[PDB]
Amino acid sequence: QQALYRTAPAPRTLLDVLDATAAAHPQAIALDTGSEALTYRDLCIEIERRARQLRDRGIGPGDRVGVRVPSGTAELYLSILAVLRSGAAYVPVDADDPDERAATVFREAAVCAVLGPDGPLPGPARPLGDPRSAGPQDDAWIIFTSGSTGAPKGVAVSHRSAAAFVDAEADLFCQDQPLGPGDRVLAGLSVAFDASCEEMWLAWRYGACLVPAPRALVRAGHELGPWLVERGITVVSTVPTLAALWPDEAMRRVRLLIVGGESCPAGLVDRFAGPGREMWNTYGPTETTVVACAARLLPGEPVRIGLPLKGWQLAVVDRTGQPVPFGAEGELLISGVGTARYLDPAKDAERFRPDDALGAARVYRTGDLVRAEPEGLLFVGRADDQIKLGGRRIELGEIDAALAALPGVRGAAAAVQTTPAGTQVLVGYVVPEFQQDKARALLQERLPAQLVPVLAEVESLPTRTSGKVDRKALPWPLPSA
Ligand SMILES: NCCCC[C@H](N)C(=O)OP(=O)(O)OC[C@H]1O[C@@H](n2cnc3c(N)ncnc32)[C@H](O)[C@@H]1O
């Protein structure tokens, strides 16, 4: 019973966080889109004018309000804050997602309204008219996580959890030179993906300024670089597949780089970590509020996912459910202040259960394999529903890493594909900065024959709405184009 990581946090709401910042930094720039540039004082005024409209419709605690507003716009973030201010919880769907996914989420969340680009629209449910403002027990957001084999499911996160996450991160990044007025935070992640909550509060927890960018820009590295320099961005939170394809010097003047959501390739550390830039790995399921553990990424060190945030508790366990010893691998379990819940009672019953190991009623079973060391966890891969090639269980991450390690490759992803006749091919998709016949030879020296993937060059790797790699979207079968 050695792989247990424990921690000791003051409960409050996200409105408490914003209002404390606004009180301390009333004249600092909170939100900056070029067109509009709002001090914290004017941000609150604009928030209140929008929240008043929602209250007039009866929206308050207990209500769920959809948000479907284009990225990179002031109104997107003003609308989210307006919902929170009114005491309701917001339910974000990316504007560029399909209308079909949007209808599913809003129906499944039972929203009483959705904020569209030209004003409020109807929601399947009706507001409940509670006049109170939110307390820590009230939901702040409901974010859908795609899952692992089924359809995406709604995760409801309380203000207490969301605030605990934001306050936890205030003890983590840049302790030597804290975030504050003068820092300028990119907001480029989809609001449907809860890492965008990290973006938002990396500004609003400290009196720094949020600088939204449209999602398309974040996927276009040659255009993003000049834009970040122009905007004076100092803080970037992103996803490895996105950043992999960015121009190397697209992070100059960025002093805090955070990656999360999928495995951070060793090469990204080599590209960005060093004196004058804190680079951090962050790991966490939507089910335990954005981030559960983090590690500084430094050159010459293995990539770790790290140690728990203040309020999170981690256990690594065998099949038996008992904690493994240091050096061993096991499934990661998470409890503490960040554990959320599923909307669907049945889904909640199978993922949140008591576990004697951590001694808590609600423990989230992540389904992730990790290796436990006293200085931090190392991510391994799936603990269940593992990819099969033929009949053999394989870990894609090891193939991803071997492809990324090739000379002349900026980014790579593997996939087990099914041929039209119904057999299987392991394919390695590679974005060259590269000689194919010579890359294959290197793969043959480092991988068992059955794990040497068929190589395919591609100009970029497709991403999901969150920014993680979209393996289903990689080209297949392989054109000679
Ligand atoms: N900076 C904020 C980051 C927040 C990430 C977000 N909460 C999230 O990813 O949540 P989900 O979209 O629900 O899926 C979580 C699952 O993705 C994998 N994962 C997340 N971070 C990872 C990391 N740093 N390294 C390797 N794998 C990671 C895990 O399989 C994890 O179960």
Report yes or no: 133 and 15 within 8 Å, Cβ to Cβ.
Answer: yes
33 lines ligand 1 (CB under 6 A): no
Report yes or no: 258 and 237 within 8 Å, Cβ to Cβ.
Answer: yes
Q: Ligand 1 pocket test: pick from 143, 283, 341, 384 the residue with the most ligand atoms within 8 Å of its Cβ.
A: 283
- Provide the token pair at 255: 């002093």
Atom of ligand 1 nearest to the CA of 284: 7
The pair phi, psi for residue 295, each rounded to 5°, is: -145, 140
Cβ atoms within 10 Å, residue 137 = 11
Task: For residue 262, report the distance from its CA to the centre of ligand 1, in Å.
Answer: 5
Report yes or no: 260 and 172 within 8 Å, Cβ to Cβ.
Answer: no
Cβ atoms within 10 Å, residue 448 = 8
* Structure letter (DSSP) for residue 250: G
Q: Is 16 helix (H, G, I), strand (E, B) or coil?
A: helix
Atom of ligand 1 nearest to the CA of 290: 7
Domain covering 387-473 assigned CATH 3.40.50.720 in the classification: no
Task: For residue 390, report the distance from its CA to the centre of ligand 1, in Å.
Answer: 28
Beta pairing partners, 18? none
Task: For residue 261, report the distance from its CA to the centre of ligand 1, in Å.
Answer: 3
Asked if residue 477 has a cis previous peptide bond (ω within 30° of 0), the answer is yes
- Provide the token pair at 342: 């599923």
Element (H, E) at 444: helix 436-446
Task: For residue 97, report the distance from its CA to the centre of ligand 1, in Å.
Answer: 20
198 lines ligand 1 (CB under 6 A): yes
Letter string b/e over residues 210-248, b meaning 16 or more CB atoms within 10 A of that residue's CB: bbbbbbebbbebeebbebbeebebbbbbbbbbbbbbbee
* Structure letter (DSSP) for residue 405: T
Counting Cα atoms < 13 Å in the Cβ hemisphere of 39 gives: 10
258 lines ligand 1 (CB under 6 A): yes
Report yes or no: 400 and 381 within 8 Å, Cβ to Cβ.
Answer: no
Beta pairing partners, 427? 415, 454
305 lines ligand 1 (CB under 6 A): yes
Q: Is 376 helix (H, G, I), strand (E, B) or coil?
A: strand
Q: Is 428 helix (H, G, I), strand (E, B) or coil?
A: strand
Rounded Cα gap, residues 187 and 218, in angstroms? 10
CATH 3.40.50.12780 maps onto the chain at: 4-376
Cβ atoms within 10 Å, residue 472 = 10
Beta pairing partners, 420? none
Task: For residue 285, report the distance from its CA to the centre of ligand 1, in Å.
Answer: 5
- Whose structure tokens read 């020296």? 445
Cβ atoms within 10 Å, residue 387 = 18
Element (H, E) at 315: strand 312-317
Closest CA to 263 of 169, 174, 396: 396
61 lines ligand 1 (CB under 6 A): no
Task: For residue 76, report the distance from its CA to the centre of ligand 1, in Å.
Answer: 24
Report yes or no: 143 and 155 within 8 Å, Cβ to Cβ.
Answer: yes
Task: For residue 314, report the distance from its CA to the centre of ligand 1, in Å.
Answer: 15
The pair phi, psi for residue 146, each rounded to 5°, is: -55, -40
Atom of ligand 1 nearest to the CA of 289: 7
SS (H, E, C) 326-365: CCCEEEEEEEECCCCEECCHHHHHHHEEEECCCCEEEEEE
- Record: fold of 4-376: Rossmann fold (3.40.50)
Rounded Cα gap, residues 251 and 280, in angstroms? 14
Q: Where are the beta strands (DSSP E) in 24-105?
A: 29-32, 37-39, 64-67, 89-92
Task: For residue 257, report the distance from its CA to the centre of ligand 1, in Å.
Answer: 16
Q: Which protein residue's CA is at the shortest distance from atom 16 of ligand 1?
A: 285
Report yes or no: 103 and 151 within 8 Å, Cβ to Cβ.
Answer: no
Cβ atoms within 10 Å, residue 321 = 15
Sign for the pseudo-dihedral over CA of 194, 196, 199, 200: negative
Pairing of strands 4-5, 312-317: antiparallel
Rounded Cα gap, residues 451 and 104, in angstroms? 38
145 lines ligand 1 (CB under 6 A): yes
Beta pairing partners, 428? 414, 455
Cβ atoms within 10 Å, residue 390 = 11
284 lines ligand 1 (CB under 6 A): yes
Atom of ligand 1 nearest to the CA of 282: 24
Rounded Cα gap, residues 315 and 6, in angstroms? 9
Task: For residue 84, report the distance from its CA to the centre of ligand 1, in Å.
Answer: 25
- Provide the token pair at 196: 């965008």
* Contact partners, residue 423, CB within 8 Å, separation at least 6: none
Q: Which protein residue's CA is at the shortest distance from atom 28 of ligand 1?
A: 262
For the CA atoms of the chain, what is the radius of gyration? 22
3-state helix, strand, coil in the chain (%, to 5): 30, 30, 40
* Structure letter (DSSP) for residue 274: B
* Structure letter (DSSP) for residue 323: B
End-to-end Cα spacing for the chain? 55
Helical segments of 247-312, H only: 266-272
To one decimal place, what's the resolution in Å?
A: 2.3
* Cα-based distances in Å from 82 to 20, 34, 52, 103, 329: 17, 21, 8, 22, 44
Cβ atoms within 10 Å, residue 469 = 28
Q: Which protein residue's CA is at the shortest distance from atom 31 of ligand 1?
A: 285
Q: Which protein residue's CA is at the shortest distance from atom 25 of ligand 1?
A: 263
Letter string b/e over residues 79-100, b meaning 16 or more CB atoms within 10 A of that residue's CB: bbbbbbbbbbbbbbbbbeeeee
* Cα-based distances in Å from 437 to 155, 216, 323, 447: 46, 34, 45, 16
**Helix 195-204 × helix 14-24 angle, to 10°:** 30
Element (H, E) at 216: helix 215-218
Report yes or no: 411 and 245 within 8 Å, Cβ to Cβ.
Answer: yes
CATH 3.30.300.30 maps onto the chain at: 387-473
